Amino acid sequence: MKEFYLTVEQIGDSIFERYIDSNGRERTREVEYKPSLFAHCPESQATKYFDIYGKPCTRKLFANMRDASQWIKRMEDIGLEALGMDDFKLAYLSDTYNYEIKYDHTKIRVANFDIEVTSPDGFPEPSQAKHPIDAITHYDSIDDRFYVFDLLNSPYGNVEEWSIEIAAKLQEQGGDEVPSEIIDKIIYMPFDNEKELLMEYLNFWQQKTPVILTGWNVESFAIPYVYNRIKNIFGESTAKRLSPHRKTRVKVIENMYGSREIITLFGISVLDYIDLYKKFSFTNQPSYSLDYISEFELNVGKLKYDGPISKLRESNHQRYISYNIIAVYRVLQIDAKRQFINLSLDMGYYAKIQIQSVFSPIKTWDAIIFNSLKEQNKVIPQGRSHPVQPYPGAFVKEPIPNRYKYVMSFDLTSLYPSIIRQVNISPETIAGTFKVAPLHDYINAVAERPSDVYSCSPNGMMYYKDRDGVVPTEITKVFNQRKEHKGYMLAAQRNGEIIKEALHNPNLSVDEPLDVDYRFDFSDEIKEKIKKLSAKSLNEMLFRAQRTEVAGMTAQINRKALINGLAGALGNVWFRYYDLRNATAITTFGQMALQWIERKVNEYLNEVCGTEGEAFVLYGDTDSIYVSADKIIDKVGESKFRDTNHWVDFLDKFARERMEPAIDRGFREMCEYMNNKQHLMFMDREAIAGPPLGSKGIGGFWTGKKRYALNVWDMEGTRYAEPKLKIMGLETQKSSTPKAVQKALKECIRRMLQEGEESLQEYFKEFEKEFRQLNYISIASVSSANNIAKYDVGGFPGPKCPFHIRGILTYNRAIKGNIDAPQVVEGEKVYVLPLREGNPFGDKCIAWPSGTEITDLIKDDVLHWMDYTVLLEKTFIKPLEGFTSAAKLDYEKKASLFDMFAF
DNA sequence: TCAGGTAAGCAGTCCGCG
DNA sequence: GCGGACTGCTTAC
Ligand SMILES: Nc1ccn([C@H]2C[C@H](O)[C@@H](COP(=O)(O)OP(=O)(O)OP(=O)(O)O)O2)c(=O)n1
Ligand SMILES: [Mg+2]
Ligand SMILES: [Mg+2]
C-alpha cells in the first residue's frame, strides 16, 4: 500500500498528522517540520530555484515554523517579497506525499451523527448548551454500525428503554418503521444519567476517532452543542477530547449582518452535509430541513409525530429515539445517491489539501498550482493586497420576445477553461499588451490583427506561445476528468431512455434485472434481453440507470465548477494569482467568441437558404447560440415528414454535417486572427426543439434575457422517449414561486408548446376555478429573510420594509410572549402569504419558517384571512400574462362573431 | 449566508407624473 | 397606474 494522509494540522512548531501507513493502518505522528521559503537573489548566486518569471531565488531553511512566519513579517517590514508556500502544512503534504495519491476509502473513518436536546424554552443555543443532551446516534463507516446513546433520566423526564422490536414494526402497526436493512446494525446503549452518557461517548470517540465528520447542521449545531455541554459539565480539558490532538479553537464566522461561532476540532475534517449539499447539488431549495431534502432526494415520507419536538421525548420516547436513528440514516441515503463525500475526498487528495478545504476553490487551486510548480523547482509568488474592483463578464443577446417554432441550440464546451488553454492565459505567460480596437471591430474582423508573435485576447493582452502556462496545464487535467465523467453521465442517460421505451411493452413474466455497467451504451445483446424483461425488472434497471446518471452528474458538474472556479479566482483579490488582466482576458475573449460565431452562423445560413441579412441566431447567453430552424424545416416541407422523430433526425443530421463544419471553420479563422496557441472552441449541438408534428403547439418562446421555454426532443444525443420541457429563468424554476403554482405554470407552458392556445385556455379556466382548494403551504411564496432587525421599529415595519420582512414582523407580533413558538431565523427562508384587509394580524401579509406548518397558535386565523385573489394575481396570473403576451397567445378565449351559442 | 466570478430578471417601496 | 431609483432576492451563465 502507498501511504496517504487523513488529516494534517499545524500546532506551534509541530505538524500533527493522522495517516494510513504502508500496511493500511491508521497512525498519528508529530513532526517538527522545518519549512522553506524563498528570497530573490542576484544572478551571481548559483541556484536551482527560480520564480515563475524565471528570476533566481535563494532557499531559506528555517529552524521552525514560527521563525518562518516571523521572517515573512520582517520581509513586509523591509518592503520585500517573501516567496514560497506560507501555509506550512500544504508544504508538508507536498514533501511527504510527492506522488499522485491513491486513497482507499475503506480505511477512512467517516462518522455521521445527530443529537437530540429537549428544550422547554425555545431553541437550545449551542453557545449556552444549558440543556441535557438526551440522545446521540453516531454511525461509523468502518464498523458499519449505528451507535445509539440514549438518556433515560433527565430533569425533563424519566423514560423507559427504546425497543428495537417496536422500532422495526410498521407505522400502521404502531411501530416507527426504522428501515429493515439497518435494524441489525444498531448498537443500543441506554444511560442512567447524562454524565455517564457523555463520558462513554468520549471513550467511544477515542476508540473510533472520526476522520471525516458529517451529518446535518453538525458544524452550526451538533458539534458546538456537544463541545459546550461537555465543557459546562466537566470543564475545558474534557471537551477538548473531541480533538485527537486535544486542541480546539472557537472560530467566528462573519457574514454581512452577520456573525456566528463554530468549534474547530484540530485533527478532524468536518464536512457538514448541509454545506456539501448547498455547494454540490446545484439546487436552490425553499427549505433545508432534513425532512424537506430527504423527501426531495429520496421520495421518503416526512417523519410524523404529535405535538412539539420539545414534548416528544416525554410523550413518545420510543418515536423520539427511532427518529434520531432515522435522521442519521437519511444523510447516508442522500450520500449513497449524490456521492458528495466521495467527490470531496477525490478533490481533496488530488489538490493535497485538508479535505475540508474543498469548500474553498482558491485554497484548492493554490495547492494544485503550488504542487505543479514545485515539481519543476519553481517558486510561487507571495500573496499581495488588492482593492476589490468590478470587471466585465459575459455577453447576453437581447432576444425579440416571441414564439419560436423550430429551434436548434449550440453551446461551447467548457468555455472559460477552453479560453485559458487556447489563449494560454497564466500569470507567467504574459508577453505584453497591444493597442485595442472596439470589441465590435474584432467581432466583425475589421480590426488590425493584434499580433504576429503572441497569442491574444481582445482586451489587449498578449501571451507566450512557446510553452503552456501552469494554469492552462493544470486546468487541462481537471477538464479531462470532467469530460470522462460527463461521458458516463450521458451514456447512463441514453441507457435510461432505452429502458423507458421498453417499459411501454413489458413482458408478463418473472425475472431479474440485468447485471450491467450503465456508464457505457448498452450493446445489442443487452438491448435484446431488455425487450424480454418484466416491468418490475425494467423499473429496477431504470432506477439503477438513473442513480448512475446522478453519480456521473455529481462527478462532472463539480469538476466543471472547479475549473470555472479558477477563471473566477483570477478575479478574486485573495487569490495568489489575482490579476484582472487575466480575468478580463477570459471574459472579453468569450464576448468576442459568441458574437463572432453569431455572425458566422448567420452568414452561413443566409447562404444556404439563398436569403440576405436575416437573423437566424435568435438568442445567446455567454457561450450559447439558439438558431431558428423554421426555414430549414420549410425547405423540405412539414408534410414530407413521417413523424416528429423524422424531422428531429433531419435537424440532427443538418447540425452535424452542415452547421458543425461551418462553426468549426468560423472558429479556426478567429483562432488565427487572435494568433492563439491552440484551437479549442468546440461548440456541440445541444437542443433540438419544436412542437409535435401535426399539433397546434408553438414549440418554444422567449420573454427576454435568461427567460425562455423549449419543447426538446433531443438533448446532446439523448433522444427522449417523451419530449422534455427545457424551461430557463421562468417562475417554474424559481424557489420563491409557490410549489403548486410552479406545477400549474409548467402545465400551462406544456400545453402552449405541445398542444396550443385552446388547450392552454381550458387549463387556465380550471386552475382559476379550483385553486382555493390547494393546501396553504403549496400556495405560499418563499423568500430568504435578511436584515430583519434593520426594518424592525418595535415591532412594526420601518421605512422601505421588504414585503417578506413585513410578514415576519406580523408573525412576531402574533406569537409575542410565546417561548415555545417557532422563531424565524435571520438568514434563513420563510413562507409568505398575503392577508385580506381588516384581518386580526393588523397587516397585509404574514411569514413563518419555511418547510414547516405554521404554529397552531395562529393557523386557523391565517387560513381564514389568506388573500387567495392577491395570491393568484401575483404568483400565477402575472407570470402567465408575461408568457402569453411574449408568445402572442391569449389565456382567455376572446369574443368572436361566432358567439351565437353555436360554436 | 465562510468558502471562484459577472449579467440580468422580477417584486416591492417610494414617489413622481400637472 | 406606470416607470425610475433603489433594495432584495433569485436565476443563467
Ligand atoms: N457558475 C458559473 C457558470 C458559468 N460560468 C461561465 C464559465 C463557463 O465556461 C461559461 C459558459 O457556461 P456553461 O454553463 O455553458 O458551462 P461551460 O461552457 O463551462 O461547460 P459546458 O457548456 O461544457 O457544460 O460561463 C461561470 O463563470 N460561473
Ligand atoms: Mg458551455
Ligand atoms: Mg452555456
Q: Classify residue A842 as left (phi > 0), alpha (psi -120 to 50) or beta.
A: left
Q: Which three cell numbers stand for residue A618?
A: 435568435
Which of A432, A402, A338, A491 has the alpha carbon at shortest distance from A703? Answer: A402
How many angstroms separate the CA atoms of A75 and A82, rounded? 6
Provide the 3-class DSSP secondary structure of residue A422: helix
Experimental method: X-ray
How many angstroms separate the CA atoms of A106 and A256, rounded? 40
- Which residues line the pocket of ligand 1, CB cutoff 6 A? A 411-416, 560, 564, 567-568, 622-623
Protein-nucleic contacts, chain A 698-757 to strand B, CB < 7 Å: 703-707, 729
Provide the 3-class DSSP secondary structure of residue A50: strand
- By CB atoms closer than 10 A (0-12, 13-18, 19+), residue A459 is buried
> What H or E segment, with its residue span, contains residue A565?
helix A535-569
Integer angstrom CA distances of residue A306 from A316, A320, A554: 9, 11, 37
Which of A614, A565, A588, A623 has the alpha carbon at shortest distance from A396? Answer: A623
Q: CA A179 → C1' B7, Å?
A: 47
Q: How far is the CA of A544 from the centre of ligand 1 (A)?
A: 29
Kindly report the CATH number that applies to the domain delimited by A1-108+340-382: 3.30.342.10
- Rounded to an integer, what is the distance from CA A726 to the centroid of its chain? 19
- Rounded to an integer, what is the distance from CA A127 to the centroid of its chain? 29
The residue nearest atom 22 of ligand 1, judged by CA position, is A413
> What H or E segment, with its residue span, contains residue A102?
none
Ligand 1 test: best mutation among A480, A490, A623, most atoms within 8 Å of CB? A623
Q: Which three cell numbers stand for residue A728?
A: 430557463
Would you state the torsion angle of the CA atoms of residues A871, A873, A874, A880, taken in this order, to the nearest 10 degrees? 130
Q: CA A775 → C1' B13, Å?
A: 30
| DSSP bridge partners of A835 | A866
Question: Any residues with CB less than 8 A from the CB of A758 and at least 6 apart, and which?
Answer: A696, A893
Q: Amino acid identity of A848?
A: W
**Cell 423568500 sits on residue:** A783
Residue A457 φ then ψ, to 5°: -115, 150
Beta strand pairing call for A624-628 and A407-412:
antiparallel
Q: CA A787 → C1' B17, Å?
A: 32
Q: Which three cell numbers stand for residue A71?
A: 521572517
Provide the 3-class DSSP secondary structure of residue A224: helix
Which of A316, A220, A296, A299 has the alpha carbon at shortest distance from A261? Answer: A220
Do residues A90 and A351 touch, judged by C-beta distance below 8 A? no
Looking at chain A, how many residues does it have? Answer: 903
Report the nearest residue to nucleotide B3, CA vs C1'.
A360
Which of A546, A536, A577 has the alpha carbon at shortest distance from A298? Answer: A546
Do residues A197 and A191 touch, judged by C-beta distance below 8 A? yes
| DSSP bridge partners of A685 | A410
Q: How many CB atoms lie within 10 A of CB A380?
A: 22
b vs e for A806-845, b when ≥16 Cβ sit within 10 Å of the residue's Cβ?
bbbbbbbebbeeeeebbebeeeebbbbbbbeeebebebbb
b vs e for A851-875, b when ≥16 Cβ sit within 10 Å of the residue's Cβ?
beebbeebeebbeebbbbeebbebb
What string of H, E and C letters represents the secondary structure of A567-623? HHHCCCCCCCCCCHHHHHHHHHHHHHHHHHHHHHHHHHHHHHHCCCCCCCEEECECC
Residue A559 φ then ψ, to 5°: -75, -40
Integer angstrom CA distances of residue A484 from A487, A490, A520, A555, A559: 5, 10, 11, 9, 11
Residue A888 φ then ψ, to 5°: 60, 40
Which of A588, A609, A614, A611 has the alpha carbon at shortest distance from A599? Answer: A614
Q: What share of chain A is helix, strand, coil (3-state, %, to 5)?
A: 45, 20, 35
Q: How far is the CA of A610 from the centre of ligand 2 (A)?
A: 30
Residue A788 φ then ψ, to 5°: -55, -45
Looking at 3.40.50.12780, 3.90.1600.10, 3.90.79.10, 3.40.50.2300, the CATH number of the domain A383-468+573-729 comes to 3.90.1600.10
- By CB atoms closer than 10 A (0-12, 13-18, 19+), residue A642 is exposed
Do residues A216 and A327 touch, judged by C-beta distance below 8 A? yes
> What H or E segment, with its residue span, contains residue A537?
helix A535-569
Query: Can you state the angle between helices A340-351 and A312-338, rounded to 10 degrees?
Result: 60
Would you state the torsion angle of the CA atoms of residues A874, A876, A882, A883, taken in this order, to the nearest 10 degrees? 170
Ligand 1 test: best mutation among A415, A481, A553, A572, most atoms within 8 Å of CB? A415
The residue nearest atom 20 of ligand 1, judged by CA position, is A414
Ligand 1 test: best mutation among A278, A556, A564, most atoms within 8 Å of CB? A564
Ligand 1 test: best mutation among A395, A413, A416, most atoms within 8 Å of CB? A416
Q: Please provide the DSSP assignment of A434-490 as one string.
A: -PPPPHHHHHTT-SPPS-SSSEE-TTSEEE--SS--HHHHHHHHHHHHHHHHHHHHH
Q: Amino acid identity of A169?
A: K
Q: Which atom of ligand 1 is nearest to the CA of A415?
A: 9
First to last CA, chain A: 81
**Nearest DNA or RNA nucleotide to A622 (CA to C1'):** C13
Residue A684 φ then ψ, to 5°: -70, 145
Specify the DSSP class assigned to residue A162: P
Q: Which three cell numbers stand for residue A266?
A: 484540530
Protein-nucleic contacts, chain A 155-174 to strand B, CB < 7 Å: none
Question: Any residues with CB less than 8 A from the CB of A39 and at least 6 apart, and which?
Answer: A57, A58, A60, A75, A80, A81, A82, A83
Where are the strands (E) in A42-200, listed by range? Answer: 49-51, 56-61, 110-117, 133-140, 145-151, 153-154, 157-158, 186-191
Q: Which three cell numbers stand for residue A428?
A: 507567467
Question: Any residues with CB less than 8 A from the CB of A131 and at least 6 apart, and which?
Answer: A117, A118, A119, A124, A156
How many angstroms separate the CA atoms of A570 and A362, rounded? 9
How many angstroms separate the CA atoms of A70 and A74, rounded? 6
Beta strand pairing call for A157-158 and A153-154:
antiparallel
Question: Any residues with CB less than 8 A from the CB of A85 and at least 6 apart, and which?
Answer: A35, A37, A91, A94, A370, A380
How many angstroms separate the CA atoms of A456 and A572, rounded? 22
Q: Which three cell numbers stand for residue A401?
A: 420576445
Provide the 3-class DSSP secondary structure of residue A412: strand
| Cα diameter, chain A | 102
How many angstroms separate the CA atoms of A10 and A88, rounded? 8
Question: Any residues with CB less than 8 A from the CB of A639 and at least 6 apart, and which?
Answer: none
Which residue ranges make up each domain of chain A? 1-108+340-382, 109-339, 383-468+573-729, 469-572, 730-774+867-889, 775-866
Q: Classify residue A883 as left (phi > 0), alpha (psi -120 to 50) or beta.
A: alpha
Specify the DSSP class assigned to residue A729: S
Q: Which-ligand-closest: CA of A586? A: 1
Q: Which atom of ligand 1 is nearest to the CA of A568?
A: 27
Q: Which three cell numbers stand for residue A217?
A: 447542521
How many angstroms separate the CA atoms of A414 and A483, rounded? 9
How many angstroms separate the CA atoms of A510 and A333, rounded? 29
Provide the 3-class DSSP secondary structure of residue A639: helix
> What H or E segment, with its residue span, contains residue A8?
strand A4-11
**Top-tier CATH class for A730-774+867-889:** mainly alpha
Question: Any residues with CB less than 8 A from the CB of A714 and at least 6 apart, and which?
Answer: A648, A652, A687, A688, A720
Q: Please provide the DSSP assignment of A800-837 as one string.
A: T--HHHHHHHHHHHHTTT-SSSPPPPTTSEEEEEEB-T
Domain covering A469-572, topology: Helix Hairpins (1.10.287)
How many angstroms separate the CA atoms of A334 and A317, rounded? 26
Integer angstrom CA distances of residue A212 from A112, A141, A299, A355, A854: 9, 10, 27, 8, 36
| DSSP bridge partners of A845 | A834
| DSSP bridge partners of A408 | A627, A688
Q: CA A754 → C1' C8, Å?
A: 36
Do residues A702 and A621 touch, judged by C-beta distance below 8 A? no
Each as own residue / partner, the long-range contacts of residues A337-340 (CB below 8 Å, 24 or more positions apart, any chain) are: A337/A297, A337/A298, A337/A547, A337/A550, A338/A277, A338/A280, A338/A281, A338/A297, A338/A550, A338/A554, A339/A550, A339/A551, A339/A554, A339/A555, A340/A273, A340/A276, A340/A277, A340/A280, A340/A281, A340/A554
The residue nearest atom 5 of ligand 1, judged by CA position, is A564
Nucleic strand B near CB of residue A786 (< 7 Å): yes
Do residues A227 and A244 touch, judged by C-beta distance below 8 A? no
Where are the strands (E) in A133-268, listed by range? Answer: 133-140, 145-151, 153-154, 157-158, 186-191, 212-214, 248-254, 259-265
Which bases of chain C come closer than 7 Å to a protein CB?
7-13
Q: How far is the CA of A587 from the centre of ligand 1 (A)?
A: 11
Q: Classify residue A380 as left (phi > 0), alpha (psi -120 to 50) or beta.
A: beta
Q: Which atom of ligand 1 is nearest to the CA of A417?
A: 9
> What H or E segment, with its residue span, contains residue A75?
helix A65-78
Q: Which three cell numbers stand for residue A559?
A: 469538476
Report the nearest residue to nucleotide B2, CA vs C1'.
A253
Beta strand pairing call for A186-191 and A145-151:
parallel
The residue nearest atom 10 of ligand 1, judged by CA position, is A415
Q: Amino acid identity of A204?
A: F
Do residues A116 and A313 touch, judged by C-beta distance below 8 A? yes
Which of A722, A719, A337 has the alpha carbon at shortest distance from A495? Answer: A719
- Rounded to an integer, what is the distance from CA A490 to the centroid of its chain? 19
How many angstroms separate the CA atoms of A782 and A430, rounded? 47
Do residues A743 and A735 touch, judged by C-beta distance below 8 A? no
Q: Which three cell numbers stand for residue A378?
A: 519553481
Nucleic strand B near CB of residue A390 (< 7 Å): yes
- Give the CA count within 13 Å in the CB-facing half-sphere of A384: 11
Q: Please provide the DSSP assignment of A644-700 as one string.
A: HHHHHHHHHHHIIIIIHHHHHHHHHHHHHHTT-SS----EEEEEEE-PPTTS----E
**Cell 453538525 sits on residue:** A218
Q: CA A491 → C1' C2, Å?
A: 51
Looking at 3.75.10.20, 3.30.420.10, 3.30.1490.20, 2.120.10.30, the CATH number of the domain A109-339 comes to 3.30.420.10
Provide the 3-class DSSP secondary structure of residue A774: coil
What architecture is the A775-866 domain classified under in CATH? Answer: 3-Layer(aba) Sandwich (3.40)
Q: CA A736 → C1' C11, Å?
A: 11
Do residues A263 and A251 touch, judged by C-beta distance below 8 A? yes
**Nearest DNA or RNA nucleotide to A587 (CA to C1'):** B6
